RNA sequence: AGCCAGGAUGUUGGCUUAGAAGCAGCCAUCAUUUAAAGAAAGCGUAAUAGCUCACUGGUCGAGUCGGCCUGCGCGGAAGA
RNA sequence: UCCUCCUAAAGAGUAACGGAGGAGCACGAAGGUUGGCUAAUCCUGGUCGGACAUCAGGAGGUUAGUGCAAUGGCAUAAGCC
RNA sequence: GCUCAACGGAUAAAAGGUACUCCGGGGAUAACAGGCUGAUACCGCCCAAGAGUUCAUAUCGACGGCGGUGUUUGGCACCUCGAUGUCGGCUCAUCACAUCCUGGGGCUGAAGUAGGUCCCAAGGGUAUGGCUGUUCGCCAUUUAAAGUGGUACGCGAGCUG
RNA sequence: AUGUAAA
RNA sequence: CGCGGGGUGGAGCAGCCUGGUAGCUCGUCGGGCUCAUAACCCGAAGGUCGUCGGUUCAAAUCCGGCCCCCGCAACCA
């Protein structure tokens, strides 16, 4: 998973979640777009 | 092909009978100059070593334009000369041989990037003598270039930068020398294959002046002209070789 | 790299970047890249910002560069002590005031210029904004 | 390469307007002619305008190109 | 915003005849039936086929979608 | 050692191995007075003559010149005869 | 009559070596170190052309930029010249994780093994010989690994030289 | 000073 | 860019210091001599002194500006 500092929506199925303060970008379509802290 | 439209180097060298073969190498320069001025080619003499009784022993000449190498591929080899030899005061027949090399352009894409991300720089303490600085400060730099395997060791001066500049200059010189040595070996391994020993053996071209015929092994050609041959007009001999070379 | 040709002097003083901007209004194109942050832009930054803005806005259109550095900045060789004369001229900076028009573009849609000026702001260190030429 | 710099010659306006000066007092030390000789003001070879009377100094902007003039009123 | 629907017949279209055919690149980016349909934004095929969105219906039934100015915060922020 | 611009913060002054440059002369005239005149750079025309000899006309204005490297000044000319 | 140009001119008249040195001193001033900063170095991030059968983002990444550390070279001399012994080696270790292995997981251009990259985690371990005084490096053979640094780039009132 | 090679 | 040496036939040198004249050698071309090659002899071309502004009756020269080539550029006891 990607561990970048700036997080944008890559595809159309990206969703901005705020799990435990950690801003995550989840994707139900492609597992490669799931990433970490932003 | 890309090489086809490319320019060429002609290297006409004297073989057997260096007195006579220089006179025939001058005639081959005359041959390909009259063949070159017919189709409007540029002829520049890069190097020409003169003989004794006239002519030239070695001629290296660039011909530029659009399509020199692709039209002159099949000229590397030997040339037998049966003629009343200018030299003979007596006048008997002889085989004067000459060797012709045809080299392509191979344009120089020199000086690749030094790639400091690929350079492993080890800055460690120095050996030798001189002061306290040898104990604590490093003053010794080793740089290894990974895809080539070249190690440069510098322990010359006190500061590292003044040794970093020397180490990069030695890296540039050693990489340029190792590339130009491979290029000169690639030139020589092809020139040894194209140019033979220089003897009169039959190597693809046969010449016959007192008979009026030249026979070419490289696709037998038995055309008795040598007067529309001695002043340009060599396309016909060259053309069926290309015709049965494009079949393969 | 943008570089002046045969100026009167080779080296000049550092100076400060005080004062407000003069190039505020857009004068040539229909849009513009107005810079908000007070900073200094080297000539490599302008050349790279031209490179990664020109390719996305393709062979049509027209782009104006409203700034020119014309200010020489030196750099001392390393492991050389302080003093001993001013250093050798290395690069060229433009002192950019708050609200200074850097690039302008005409012949493009608004969304294409919006997406190109974001990349031009990403290639530059100073903060910019997006402006549009109002008539008078 | 650089480093040479000269000693200053202490130019400028020594006697400003309003102040009464004696006869022969130096008013303005100038390099060229920024000020010109008017009433009761002499000019030297060093372009140094000096006093010729006992009065007050007055600056005027007469002339076609608005050149400066120093005058001295006998007060 | 979700939910069962639609999202067409020639378009195997002329193109470099091996195929690019709604979706490599060319340009044209028509027009009908019309509650609605871009001769197409994406996925997938050698090209098809197929799957969604554009948009339009219906159940539903109250406010919602996208930008500007800032205040305080979040992360980037890891040493012996 | 000395001179000129900045540094130098609008009187004077002001430091750094700061940034640009020069001088260790010359002049019997290039000095004094009197009298008279205004260049540089372009355009047109003309035998040699051609981008530039010189002259005539026009624009232009002190960008010319001031022995000398730079600053200030100069037509009432300090420029020229 | 002085380029007495060291030009307010010590004589009219004067170059060098000291590791054989010696004295009065100085941290007013250097070397080793500690201190401040981080041009340089190492590492992390922003943007994105492009490499990758398609496909920037599996892995890389030009042109550019922003930050962290005080581990290299640097800069200034703040402390030391009425004395702070430093390089390498032997023994003894301590601490941080920017993790070499073991452990738990995510992506993959991950069929399985063997992999590439990344997050958390310092509890434990983290070579043997030749050369060189050498740290380091190469070679030979193991290992699961042959980690990076700080501690006066550790440790001579513990030891050689 | 010299002037190779095919009776 | 900073410093030094310069820019003289196709090439290398005089000649610059100290001004009043373009010179020498090698080379190129052509012709004799030999049957020829080498050697020797003769003739021709070639540069305005890298270029430009000033002093001078006169700049290849003296001075300055520009262009080009080569070499030198921080060590270190």
Curated annotation (Swiss-Prot), chain A:
Q: Cross-referenced PROSITE patterns, in alphabetical order?
A: RIBOSOMAL_L36
Coiled-coil residue spans? none
Question: Which GO annotations describe the biological process of this protein?
Answer: cytoplasmic translation; translation
Q: Is Ribosomal protein found in the keyword set? A: yes
Which UniProt keywords are listed? Answer: Ribonucleoprotein, Ribosomal protein, RNA-binding, rRNA-binding
* Molecular function GO terms recorded: rRNA binding; structural constituent of ribosome
Classification via InterPro entries: Ribosomal_bL36, Ribosomal_bL36_sp
Entry keyword rRNA-binding: yes
Instruction: Show the GO cellular component annotation of the record.
Output: cytoplasm; cytosolic large ribosomal subunit
Pfam families xref list: Ribosomal_L36 (PF00444)
Matching SUPFAM superfamilies, A to Z? Answer: Ribosomal protein L36
Q: Which family does it belong to?
A: Belongs to the bacterial ribosomal protein bL36 family.
The record's note on quaternary structure and interaction partners says: Part of the 50S ribosomal subunit.
- Protein task: One of the last ribosomal proteins to be assembled in the 50S subunit, it contacts a number of helices in the 23S rRNA, acting as molecular glue. The simultaneous presence of uL16 and bL36 probably triggers ObgE's GTPase activity and eventual dissociation from the mature 50S ribosomal subunit.
Protein name as it appears in the record: Large ribosomal subunit protein bL36A
Give the source species.
Escherichia coli (strain K12)
The gene designation is: rpmJ
Swiss-Prot record, chain B:
Cite a single GO MF annotation: ribosome binding
- Which GO CC terms are listed, alphabetically? cytosol
UniProtKB keywords: Cytoplasm, Methylation, Protein biosynthesis
Q: Please state where this protein is localized.
A: Cytoplasm
* Segments of this protein annotated with the region Disordered: 181-210
- What would changing residue 132 to E/A do, according to UniProt? Loss of methylation
N5-methylglutamine PTM sites in chain numbering: 132
PTM: Methylated by PrmC. Methylation increases the termination efficiency of RF1.
Coiled coil stretches, renumbered: none
GO BP terms: namely: translational termination
Q: Which family does it belong to?
A: Belongs to the prokaryotic/mitochondrial release factor family.
Task: Relate the protein's function as given in its record.
Answer: Peptide chain release factor 1 directs the termination of translation in response to the peptide chain termination codons UAG and UAA.
Question: What name does this protein carry?
Answer: Peptide chain release factor RF1
Q: Which organism is it from?
A: Escherichia coli (strain K12)
Organism placement in taxonomy:
Bacteria, Pseudomonadati, Pseudomonadota, Gammaproteobacteria, Enterobacterales
The encoding gene is prfA
UniProtKB/Swiss-Prot annotation, chain C:
Give the keywords, sorted: Hydroxylation, Methylation, Ribonucleoprotein, Ribosomal protein, RNA-binding, rRNA-binding, tRNA-binding
Post-translationally, this protein is described as follows, namely: Is hydroxylated on Arg-81 by RoxA. The modification is nearly suppressed when E.coli is grown in anoxia.
Q: Name one GO biological process term.
A: ribosomal large subunit assembly
Q: Which residues are annotated as modified residue N-methylmethionine in the UniProt record?
A: 1
The cross-references to InterPro entries, in alphabetical order and at most eight, read: Ribosomal_uL16 (IPR047873), Ribosomal_uL16_bact-type (IPR000114), Ribosomal_uL16_CS (IPR020798), Ribosomal_uL16_dom (IPR016180), Ribosomal_uL16_sf (IPR036920)
What's a Pfam family this protein contains?
Ribosomal_L16
Modified-residue entries ((3R)-3-hydroxyarginine), positions: 81
Nucleotide-binding is among the record's keywords: no
Q: Which molecular-function annotation in GO is an example for this chain?
A: structural constituent of ribosome
What is any one of the record's Gene Ontology cellular component terms? cytosolic large ribosomal subunit
Q: Does the keyword RNA-binding apply?
A: yes
Q: How does it assemble?
A: Part of the 50S ribosomal subunit. Cross-links to the A and P site tRNAs. Interacts with assembly factor DarP(YjgA).
Name the protein family: Belongs to the universal ribosomal protein uL16 family.
List, alphabetically, the HAMAP family matched.
Ribosomal_uL16
What does it do? Answer: Binds directly to 23S ribosomal RNA and is located at the A site of the peptidyltransferase center. It contacts the A and P site tRNAs. One of the last ribosomal proteins to be assembled in the 50S subunit. The simultaneous presence of uL16 and bL36 probably triggers ObgE's GTPase activity and eventual dissociation from the mature 50S ribosmal subunit. It has an essential role in subunit assembly.
Q: Which NCBIfam families match?
A: rplP_bact (TIGR01164)
Name recorded for this polypeptide: Large ribosomal subunit protein uL16
Give the source species. Escherichia coli (strain K12)
Lineage, uppermost ranks: Bacteria, Pseudomonadati, Pseudomonadota, Gammaproteobacteria, Enterobacterales
Curated annotation (Swiss-Prot), chain D:
Q: Does the keyword Nucleotide-binding apply?
A: no
One Gene Ontology molecular-function label? structural constituent of ribosome
PROSITE patterns named among the record's database cross-references = RIBOSOMAL_L27 (PS00831)
A GO cellular component annotation here is:
cytosolic large ribosomal subunit
Question: What's a BP term from Gene Ontology annotated to this protein?
Answer: assembly of large subunit precursor of preribosome
Q: Which Pfam families has this protein been placed in? A: Ribosomal_L27
Q: Which HAMAP family match?
A: Ribosomal_bL27
Similarity section: Belongs to the bacterial ribosomal protein bL27 family.
Q: Which NCBIfam families match?
A: L27 (TIGR00062)
Q: Oligomeric state and partners?
A: Part of the 50S ribosomal subunit. Cross-links to the 23S rRNA. Cross-links to the A and P site tRNAs.
Task: Quote the protein name from its UniProt record.
Answer: Large ribosomal subunit protein bL27
């Amino acid at each position: 998973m990607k561990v970048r500092a700036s997080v944008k929506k890559l595809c159309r199925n990206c969703k901005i979640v705020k799990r435990d303060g950690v801003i995550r970008v989840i994707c139900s379509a492609e597992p490669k777009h799931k990433q970490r802290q932003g | 092909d890309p090489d086809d439209e490319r320019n060429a180097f002609l290297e006409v060298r004297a073989g057997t009978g260096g007195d006579e073969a220089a006179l025939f190498a001058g005639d081959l320069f005359r041959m390909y100059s009259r063949y070159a001025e017919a189709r409007r080619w540029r002829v520049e003499i890069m190097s020409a070593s003169e003989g004794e009784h006239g002519g030239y022993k070695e001629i290296i000449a660039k011909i530029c334009g659009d399509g020199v190498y692709g039209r002159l591929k099949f000229e590397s080899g030997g040339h037998r000369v049966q003629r009343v030899p200018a030299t003979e005061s007596q006048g008997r027949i002889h085989t004067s041989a000459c060797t012709v090399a045809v080299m392509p352009e191979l344009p120089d894409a020199e000086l690749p990037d030094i790639n400091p991300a690929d350079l492993r720089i080890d800055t460690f303490r120095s050996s030798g003598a001189g002061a306290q600085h040898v104990n604590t400060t490093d003053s010794a730099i080793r740089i290894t270039h990974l895809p080539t395997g070249i190690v440069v060791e510098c322990q010359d001066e006190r500061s590292q930068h003044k040794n970093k500049a020397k180490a990069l200059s030695v890296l540039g010189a050693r990489i340029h020398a190792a590339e130009m040595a491979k290029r000169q070996q690639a030139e020589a391994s092809t020139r040894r294959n194209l140019l033979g020993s220089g003897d009169r053996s039959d190597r693809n071209r046969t010449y016959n002046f007192p008979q009026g015929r030249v026979t070419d092994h490289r696709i037998n050609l038995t055309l008795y002209r040598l007067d529309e041959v001695m002043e340009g007009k060599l396309d016909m001999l060259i053309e069926p070789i290309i015709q049965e070379h494009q079949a393969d | 790299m943008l570089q002046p040709k045969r100026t009167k002097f080779r080296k000049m003083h550092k100076g400060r970047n005080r004062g407000l901007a003069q190039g505020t209004d857009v004068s040539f194109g229909s849009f513009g890249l107005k810079a908000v942050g007070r900073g200094r832009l080297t000539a490599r930054q302008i050349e790279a910002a031209r490179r990664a803005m020109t390719r996305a806005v393709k062979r049509q259109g027209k782009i104006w560069i409203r700034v020119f550095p014309d200010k020489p900045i030196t750099e001392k060789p390393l492991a050389v002590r302080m003093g001993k004369g001013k250093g050798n001229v290395e690069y060229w900076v433009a002192l950019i005031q708050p609200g200074k028009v850097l690039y302008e573009m005409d012949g493009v849609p608004e969304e294409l210029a919006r997406e190109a000026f974001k990349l031009a702001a990403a290639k530059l260190p100073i903060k910019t904004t997006f402006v549009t030429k109002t008539v008078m | 390469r650089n480093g040479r710099d000269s000693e200053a010659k202490r130019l400028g306006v020594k006697r400003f307007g309003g102040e009464s000066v004696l006869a022969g007092s130096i008013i303005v030390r100038q390099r060229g002619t920024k000020f010109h000789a008017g009433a009761n003001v002499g000019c030297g070879r060093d372009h140094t305008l000096f006093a010729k009377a006992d009065g007050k100094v007055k600056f005027e902007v007469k002339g076609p190109k608005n050149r400066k003039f120093i005058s001295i009123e006998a007060e």
